[PDB]
Amino acid sequence: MNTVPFTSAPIEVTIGIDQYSFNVKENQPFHGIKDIPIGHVHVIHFQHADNSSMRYGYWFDCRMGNFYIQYDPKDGLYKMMEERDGAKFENIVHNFKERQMMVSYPKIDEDDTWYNLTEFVQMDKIRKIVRKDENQFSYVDSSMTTVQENELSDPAHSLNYTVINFKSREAIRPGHEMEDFLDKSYYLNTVMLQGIFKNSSNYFGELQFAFLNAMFFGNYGSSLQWHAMIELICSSATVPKHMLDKLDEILYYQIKTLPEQYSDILLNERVWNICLYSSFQKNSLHNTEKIMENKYPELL
Amino acid sequence: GAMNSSNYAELFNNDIKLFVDDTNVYRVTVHKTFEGNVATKAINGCIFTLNPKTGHLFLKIIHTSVWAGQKRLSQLAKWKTAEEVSALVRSLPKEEQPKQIIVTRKAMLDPLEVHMLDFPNIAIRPTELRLPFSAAMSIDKLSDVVMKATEPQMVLFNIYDDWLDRISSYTAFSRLTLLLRALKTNEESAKMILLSDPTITIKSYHLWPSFTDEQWITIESQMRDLILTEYGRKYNV
Ligand SMILES: O=C(O)CCC(=O)c1ccc(F)cc1
Numbered sequence: 001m002n003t004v005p006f007t008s009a010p011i012e013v014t015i016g017i018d019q020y021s022f023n024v025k026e027n028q029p030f031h032g033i034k035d036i037p038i039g040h041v042h043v044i045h046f047q048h049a050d051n052s053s054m055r056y057g058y059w060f061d062c063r064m065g066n067f068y069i070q071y072d073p074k075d076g077l078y079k080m081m082e083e084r085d086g087a088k089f090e091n092i093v094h095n096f097k098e099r100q101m102m103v104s105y106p107k108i109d110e111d112d113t114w115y116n117l118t119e120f121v122q123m124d125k126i127r128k129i130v131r132k133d134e135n136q137f138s139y140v141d142s143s144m145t146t147v148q149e150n151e152l153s154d155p156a157h158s159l160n161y162t163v164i165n166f167k168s169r170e171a172i173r174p175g176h177e178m179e180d181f182l183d184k185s186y187y188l189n190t191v192m193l194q195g196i197f198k199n200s201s202n203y204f205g206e207l208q209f210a211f212l213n214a215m216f217f218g219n220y221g222s223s224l225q226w227h228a229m230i231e232l233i234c235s236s237a238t239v240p241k242h243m244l245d246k247l248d249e250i251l252y253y254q255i256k257t258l259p260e261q262y263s264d265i266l267l268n269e270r271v272w273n274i275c276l277y278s279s280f281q282k283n284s285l286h287n288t289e290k291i292m293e294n295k296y297p298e299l300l
Numbered sequence: 301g302a303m304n305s306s307n308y309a310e311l312f313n314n315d316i317k318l319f320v321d322d323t324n325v326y327r328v329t330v331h332k333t334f335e336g337n338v339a340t341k342a343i344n345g346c347i348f349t350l351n352p353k354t355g356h357l358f359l360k361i362i363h364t365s366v367w368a369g370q371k372r373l374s375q376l377a378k379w380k381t382a383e384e385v386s387a388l389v390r391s392l393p394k395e396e397q398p399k400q401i402i403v404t405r406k407a408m409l410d411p412l413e414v415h416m417l418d419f420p421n422i423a424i425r426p427t428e429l430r431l432p433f434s435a436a437m438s439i440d441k442l443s444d445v446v447m448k449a450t451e452p453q454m455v456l457f458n459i460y461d462d463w464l465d466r467i468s469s470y471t472a473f474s475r476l477t478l479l480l481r482a483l484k485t486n487e488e489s490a491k492m493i494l495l496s497d498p499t500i501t502i503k504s505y506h507l508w509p510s511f512t513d514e515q516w517i518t519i520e521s522q523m524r525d526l527i528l529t530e531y532g533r534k535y536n537v
Pocket residue numbers: 354355356357358456457458461
């Protein structure tokens with residue numbers, strides 16, 4: 001297990017770590033989070049008590065370096081930093097661990113929730129969507145726009161998700177207009193899977209990353225991207241069978257984890273009714289259909 | 301966006317535009333089979349593509365062979381319409397290409413948009429006007445060319461005859477829409493009004509009779525009376 005220490009907590013803040021969250025009071029003696037399960041990406045996220053504007057956070061992998069959080073009073077946020085002095089770093093954490101100034105990542109042993117939400121998410125792929133090459137971790141916030149959103153405005157601060165547009169020349173072969181618009185299999189399998197993503201694992205990783213950015217930061221363009229990537233699969237008559245089975249599992253855990261009180265805003269009625277009841281794959285998402293019907297029957 | 305009554309004068313400005321109506325593309329007769337089921341038989345159709353400023357009607361005749369062996373014909377019909385309009389715009393030189401194409405039914409929007417991806421500068425728009433272009437087939441010469449077709453064919457007409465020599469496009473469109481509404485509301489009565497009098501004839505290349513200006517006023521009043529008369533018959537007014 002690895003550790004994200006904090007220099008301090010000078011401002012009152014709700015801290016997120018993956019799907020967990022806890023409150024820290026202004027100048028409470030907090031020095032971070034320990035026992036973080038190795039083998040997964042993680043996300044540490046922040047919502048200030050005195051200004052819920054700008055949820056923000058960092059995607060990181062403890063295998064890639066020693067990272068800590070320090071408040072910057074000038075820019076007004078908790079910043080992630082990398083410490084290269086490894087023995088310095090261990091020395092600091094051990095003192096914080098000895099004084100019990102760190103919360104423990106509260107992972108139940110039965111519980112695979114985080115694995116199931118991040119199965120295909122890799123740090124190297126995150127760092128290509130979020131471009132800041134000097135850091136091994138990636139900053140995302142509530143307000144960052146996506147490349148596609150910026151085509152319809154500081155490119156350095158943008159989410160470079162793969163653009164999906166059903167009425168674009170990329171999606172529609174000259175001479176196959178009706179075919180390709182009503183059956184997106186060409187766009188899914190040739191343009192996206194074989195051409196851009198190379199395999200379904202990269203596709204699902206971007207889909208899972210988009211969902212998590214929507215859920216944890218309220219990032220609107222991330223929510224658009226997650227729905228577009230679901231719709232493109234569901235709107236395809238020809239999808240490898242293992243892809244459909246895995247999608248059902250991926251979506252089931254996303255719907256299971258979504259806060260019930262955020263459903264009115266995180267779920268697009270049109271996309272979901274189309275995918276579950278009218279689409280080519282309307283019968284291929286049994287687990288997702290069952291949780292959506294039992295948990296959010298109003299949306300449908 | 302949509303075209304309506306506030307921006308009605310825009311139809312007659314100098315931006316080339318085309319109305320497209322697909323309501324007579326896929327046409328069928330419904331009949332009983334020997335086993336007592338119901339069966340359809342397609343008959344020839346047409347796309348009604350009209351530039352409102354000039355009166356130019358690009359009548360693409362849809363021959364029944366295009367439906368042979370095809371499924372979901374009502375859906376295919378929209379995409380076939382969009383294919384043909386796209387082919388028409390490609391056939392014209394850049395200076396005769398529309399800036400806007402207005403579809404009379406919103407179901408034509410996605411088909412036409414997808415077929416016209418190569419033409420990002422041509423706006424594809426619905427309209428809130430209820431245009432009676434379905435009654436094109438009540439015009440005898442147009443009906444005749446469509447039903448006689450033995451193969452796909454593009455037949456060209458001025459839907460205003462030579463009215464633009466004496467009236468504005470705005471007025472010519474108003475006249476056309478009143479005539480077509482009347483033909484749509486009571487076809488037999490409308491044709492009676494138009495052809496009651498034998499000494500007013502239809503010139504060899506024209507669709508409508510050669511009414512003088514004063515006779516057109518009389519005809520227009522009779523057409524209005526017909527619409528009002530049918531509206532009263534309908535609603536018991
Ligand atoms: O403007 C006129 O009066 C003559 C030309 C004309 O009526 C026309 C109609 C259809 C077409 F495709 C091309 C020309």
